TrEMBL record, chain A:
Keywords: Eukaryotic host gene expression shutoff by virus, Host cytoplasm, Host gene expression shutoff by virus, Host mRNA suppression by virus, Host nucleus, Host-virus interaction, Inhibition of host innate immune response by virus, Inhibition of host interferon signaling pathway by virus, Inhibition of host PKR by virus, Inhibition of host pre-mRNA processing by virus, Inhibition of host RIG-I by virus, Inhibition of host RLR pathway by virus, Interferon antiviral system evasion, RNA-binding, Viral immunoevasion. The chain holds residues 80 to 200 of 215 of the full protein. It comes from Influenza A virus. The dsRNA-binding region is required for suppression of RNA silencing. Inhibits post-transcriptional processing of cellular pre-mRNA, by binding and inhibiting two cellular proteins that are required for the 3'-end processing of cellular pre-mRNAs: the 30 kDa cleavage and polyadenylation specificity factor/CPSF4 and the poly(A)-binding protein 2/PABPN1. In turn, unprocessed 3' end pre-mRNAs accumulate in the host nucleus and are no longer exported to the cytoplasm. Cellular protein synthesis is thereby shut off very early after virus infection. This is Non-structural protein 1.
TrEMBL record, chain B:
GO terms for cellular component: host cell cytoplasm; host cell nucleus. GO terms for molecular function: protein serine/threonine kinase inhibitor activity; RNA binding. It is found in: Host nucleus; Host cytoplasm. GO terms for biological process: symbiont-mediated suppression of host cytoplasmic pattern recognition receptor signaling pathway via inhibition of RIG-I activity; symbiont-mediated suppression of host gene expression; symbiont-mediated suppression of host mRNA processing; symbiont-mediated suppression of host PKR/eIFalpha signaling; symbiont-mediated suppression of host type I interferon-mediated signaling pathway. This is Non-structural protein 1. The dsRNA-binding region is required for suppression of RNA silencing. The lineage of its organism: Viruses, Riboviria, Orthornavirae, Negarnaviricota, Polyploviricotina.
Amino acid sequence: PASRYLTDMTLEEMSRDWFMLMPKQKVAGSLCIKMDQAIMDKTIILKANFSVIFDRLETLILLRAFTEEGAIVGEISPLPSLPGHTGEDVKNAIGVLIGGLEANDNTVRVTETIQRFAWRN
Amino acid sequence: KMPASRYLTDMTLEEMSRDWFMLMPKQKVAGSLCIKMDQAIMDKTIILKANFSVIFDRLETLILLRAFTEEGAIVGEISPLPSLPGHTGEDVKNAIGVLIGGLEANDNTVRVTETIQRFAWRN
């Protein structure tokens, strides 16, 4: 069955190139987690793009962390060369990103989209 | 107040941002939408794929529509114009008709995704 994609992000927020002043990268499961460890005391929202089949979110395509002004400070992207991530890989990557950002005293929330994927896997 | 939009797409990110060109250009601005079609494309099988914004499980606004051949070439497009006042559901329906009619005139077989079919049927 062909997939459709449900996103929280505009096409520009998904393709905008961003960089970290203080890079931090971890690879967990088959996902790449990035976070600018220079960002502190900001209000962050995690926004995602999922592939959706039969009204249920299936796979993570892109996850991006945005400040209230709109700057990209973090990202969770799959690695194409590596075998497909599971629902557990995604949940763990979210916790890794959240924990990392909160360590720099950043307030972080997720969209209903992420909340529904997590709760259902 | 106002509710935040999510986006439901038929296309991968690369499909939405891939650059393409018409060997025989045909363009028009209708309502507040830009309609493009390569008038050099003939006797092909085409599918129209779209990206719509959504609030409360109902498609609201067109973000981008593209026309793909079975091989994956982009032959047509419907995009909103940001400087112009927001297009309606009727503008979109008409633009799709204009694109379909145009492509059928060159003996192309044209079909739409379920996403477009649902937007049209509901507006």
